[PDB]
Design a protein around this ligand. Structure first.
Ligand SMILES: CC(=O)Nc1ccc(N(C(=O)Cn2nnc3ccccc32)[C@@H](C(=O)NC(C)(C)C)c2ccsc2)cc1
Ligand SMILES: CC(=O)Nc1ccc(N(C(=O)Cn2nnc3ccccc32)[C@@H](C(=O)NC(C)(C)C)c2ccsc2)cc1
Lengths: 306, 306
């Protein structure tokens, strides 16, 4: 029992982190097969940050403009033999395949989804933590500028699914990045301009999962006979910065295991949103919306209702 | 910017996890050089879990009683050639040295310290998270049945410092384990027999570090001209379930870079202990006490205010 922010083990990803340097800019890259991925803003000099011409920058660089090095494990200096843009990513082809390339896929995650982040600095892994893609397609992580190129991923059946490369910090504690097809998460540009975020929202289904986790962990004071219809909840959600609720099988199974209905949990959200009455749930006095139903399922596996 | 629960990257530790089976019981072990460590209660049948005679169990076991396998990476079946007891740990000697043994040390952390945990199941690493040793020397983690033998650790300069092997759950979300000298944290016993936990307390020095981290991240509404001297806060602490405050250099450094005095933070604590009055700090409406001053230093390295 217990519920904590848990990440996927980072070893397979650590084997792929490298340092990329272009001019006086340096950040992290991801080395898979004969390719190194890193944010394209590595090419942009500080004085062009507000209006970069990335097409111009790209072909103003030679291959030997890029220095790519692996600092950890089997160290190496890697020769770049081609460079091109993939959306807001720079794709460096190098002349040696990473012998430690894991089995991997690329995916783009949806708002509400969690993934693990390996934070890196200067081509060295420094920390691991888990984030959730926010309603406005940002994340709440912990990064420095040198952390650009840090990698988000999930893991299943020994396959690493790479889903995020860190690109920038928008506002205090608020970050975004791109998937590895080079599409930036959200409506964000890799420029130095004031950009406005769409308003964030609590992810309802994640809050519901969290409330089920709580009940399975013996915390159930917030459960009342009170229920609210899904249609009524969703109306209310529109005006109170919560996502619409749509049921899933895993939520139904958490309901079955606890004996607490989905409608009771949505009612509890409406009451709790108004205030926690000086009480806590799994140690918090605010709604937690970064646990998916799948994240919860992993940490309550085999846990029996009491 | 941003402050999250960060763990040390797990790759170096993943390479040392194995599965240990003794009769009907299976759990995780840690393989370093020619040694495999695992909890000694692997020797105990479901029956005599109530009052095990570990000394008798030990002599009834032969080296062939113990099956040790590596299921990940370079797989391996390891032959046990000696076994001895080390407090609440079993120390198995195997005929093959782990080729991927990292540079390592052992240590025993003190209440208030943080460390990373690699949750394991059937000898397979499944997740990483960070915990904090509570005032009563328990940790608030997330552990399921076959997670015994899961490993806690910190990183010290290319050196893995092993500090914890998971032993048992005491109550919902409440766990303990041993250092690798085989001394149980909290002196709890590896018996069934329900044991009384000392009362937990908020770690004052960590709360203070968290408030500094808040101030360093633009959240500063709680700071008042109000001060309260250390001597006075400590008297108050004894009656309100906080640990007594003792100044350290890292705290001084943070007070220094914030311009906010320790006495001001202690004041905020007494006030915030009364209530957050509807407001939040770093998104929470409760006092966070699981970030050490060093943890915070790390995530505020190279950060200047507003
Ligand atoms: C030569 C040089 O200085 N290059 C550079 C500068 C800034 C960034 N940005 C980051 O977010 C860098 N970054 N990424 N993670 C960070 C965490 C803390 C601080 C900064 C962080 C973007 C941005 O908007 N930054 C401000 C300062 C306005 C917030 C950006 C992207 C393309 S152009 C500008 C990227 C590259
Ligand atoms: C064959 C067999 O039954 N083996 C076995 C089972 C359980 C444990 N325990 C764990 O905490 C195992 N453990 N460790 N973390 C857990 C999280 C959830 C559930 C179980 C967990 C202890 C305990 O509390 N057990 C009761 C029965 C009270 C539940 C314990 C420690 C020394 S003696 C007994 C140890 C060995």
């Amino acid at each position: 029992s217990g519920l904590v922010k848990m990440s996927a083990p980072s070893g397979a990803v650590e084997n792929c982190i490298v340092q990329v340097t272009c001019g006086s800019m340096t950040l992290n890259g991801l080395w898979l097969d004969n390719t190194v991925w890193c944010p394209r803003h590595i090419m942009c000099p500080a004085d062009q940050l507000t209006d970069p011409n990335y097409d111009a920058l790209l072909i103003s660089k030679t291959n030997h403009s890029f220095i790519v090095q692996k600092h950890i494990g089997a160290q190496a200096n890697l020769r770049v033999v081609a460079h091109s843009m993939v959306g807001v990513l720079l794709k460096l082809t190098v002349d040696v395949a990473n012998p430690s390339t894991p089995a991997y896929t690329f995916s783009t995650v949806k708002p509400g989804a969690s993934f693990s982040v390996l934070a890196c600095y200067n081509g060295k892994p420094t920390g691991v933590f888990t984030v959730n893609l926010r309603h406005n397609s940002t994340i709440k992580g912990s990064f420095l500028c040198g952390s650009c190129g840090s990698v988000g991923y999930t893991e299943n059946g020994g396959v690493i699914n790479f889903v995020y490369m860190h690109q920038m910090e928008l506002s205090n504690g608020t970050h975004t990045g791109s998937s590895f097809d080079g599409v930036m998460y959200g409506a964000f540009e890799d420029k130095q301009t004031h950009q406005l975020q769409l308003t964030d929202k609590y992810c309802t289904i994640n809050v519901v999962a969290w409330l089920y986790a709580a009940v399975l962990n013996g915390c159930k004071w917030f459960v009342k006979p009170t229920r609210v219809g899904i249609v009524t909840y969703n109306e209310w959600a529109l005006s109170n910065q919560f996502t619409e609720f749509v049921g899933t099988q895993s939520i139904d199974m958490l309901a079955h295991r606890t004996g607490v209905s989905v409608e009771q949990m949505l009612a509890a959200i409406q009451s709790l949103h108004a205030g926690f009455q000086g009480k806590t749930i799994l140690g918090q006095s605010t709604l937690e919306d970064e646990f998916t139903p799948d994240d919860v399922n992993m940490q309550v596996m085999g846990v029996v209702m009491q």
